[PDB]
Amino acid sequence: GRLIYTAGGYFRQSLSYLEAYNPSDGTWLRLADLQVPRSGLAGCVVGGLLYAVGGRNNSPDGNTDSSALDCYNPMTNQWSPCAPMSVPRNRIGVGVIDGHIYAVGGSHGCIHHNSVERYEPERDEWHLVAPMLTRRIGVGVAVLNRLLYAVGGFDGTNRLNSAECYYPERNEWRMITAMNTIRSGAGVCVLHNCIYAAGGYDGQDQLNSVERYDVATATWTFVAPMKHRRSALGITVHQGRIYVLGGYDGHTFLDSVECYDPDTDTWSEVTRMTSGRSGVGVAVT
Amino acid sequence: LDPETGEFL
Numbered sequence A: 001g002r003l004i005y006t007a008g009g010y011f012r013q014s015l016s017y018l019e020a021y022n023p024s025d026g027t028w029l030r031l032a033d034l035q036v037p038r039s040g041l042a043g044c045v046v047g048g049l050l051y052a053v054g055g056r057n058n059s060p061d062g063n064t065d066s067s068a069l070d071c072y073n074p075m076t077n078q079w080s081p082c083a084p085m086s087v088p089r090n091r092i093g094v095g096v097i098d099g100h101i102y103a104v105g106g107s108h109g110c111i112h113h114n115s116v117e118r119y120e121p122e123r124d125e126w127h128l129v130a131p132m133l134t135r136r137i138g139v140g141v142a143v144l145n146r147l148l149y150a151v152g153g154f155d156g157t158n159r160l161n162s163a164e165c166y167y168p169e170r171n172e173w174r175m176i177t178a179m180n181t182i183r184s185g186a187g188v189c190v191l192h193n194c195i196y197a198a199g200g201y202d203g204q205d206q207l208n209s210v211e212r213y214d215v216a217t218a219t220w221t222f223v224a225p226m227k228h229r230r231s232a233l234g235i236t237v238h239q240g241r242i243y244v245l246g247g248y249d250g251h252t253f254l255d256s257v258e259c260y261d262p263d264t265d266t267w268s269e270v271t272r273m274t275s276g277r278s279g280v281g282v283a284v285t
Numbered sequence B: 001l002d003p004e005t006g007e008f009l
Helices: none
Strands: A004-007 A018-022 A027-030 A042-046 A049-053 A056-058 A063-065 A069-073 A078-081 A093-097 A100-104 A116-120 A125-128 A140-144 A147-154 A159-167 A172-176 A187-191 A194-198 A210-214 A219-223 A234-237 A242-248 A253-261 A266-272 A281-284
Touching (some): A004 A042, A042 A093, A042 A100, A049 A281, A100 A147, A147 A194, A187 A234, A194 A242
Parallel strands (some): A042 A281
Antiparallel strands (some): A004 A281, A042 A049, A116 A125, A147 A159, A210 A219, A234 A242, A253 A266
16 A cells, blocks of 8 residues: 655746655545755655655746755655755656665756766765766666666757666666667656656657567567657556656646556556646655 | 756746
8 A cells, every 4th residue: 555656846836745646545645845846856765765866946036956865754744854966966867776876867057967876874975886878867767687777868969769777786887778769858667577668758759659678688669658748757666557647748737647557558547646747756655 | 948848947
């Protein structure tokens, strides 16, 4: 009976929302707001505690990119701030390996980071690891076989279809089979030993195509596409199904939440977010 | 107007 948490996002301005959805009863919870509003953040969980990493506060008054790590305990319904990252990271990618949070890529103004840094909850310290081969913002991240994959994004010049693996024990990056489609701002997650990359922006249009990396074969195969095209969308997995959340379809801000069943290979509309938004963080606990 | 996020910078 774990919930799908969603933090922040954008609609006219950067948002402070923290909300949880329960697929068993189809209900939404209104939880404690973020201390500082933000969009283009990422979510993750370590030891039952939700973390919200980076992003930016694009308000009416102006724009400030975030280096902040804040931590939310479900049991106490309270946000607590943690040690900040070495640099700010808007459109950040995040993954978890052995209770350590990896901050991947993202931007600060005109700087498009290829750096990566690693958070240790028990010490509350950030340390730089080996940087990625390509600079990436709008980057999907997915932990699989204890390796961290950085998929797609924007390099400062072009939208990317390239992906690359990180090796924590060796501390080094390696390119892998590039994607069928170009995808910046895609939702990237891990279901049944495969990486799925859903949605995103190819350089011209928004996307509903979903493609699946098999590790053994090293090839990306298309699966059934989404009903609603989207970019800068939220994504997670909950009990053997992929959930995509909100986003921007070129015209409007989505509150649609679609759900992928891998057995039937069919997407379906399950619920609506309480208000349409893009650039949310998402995690499950 | 960012085409990917829809944010107005």
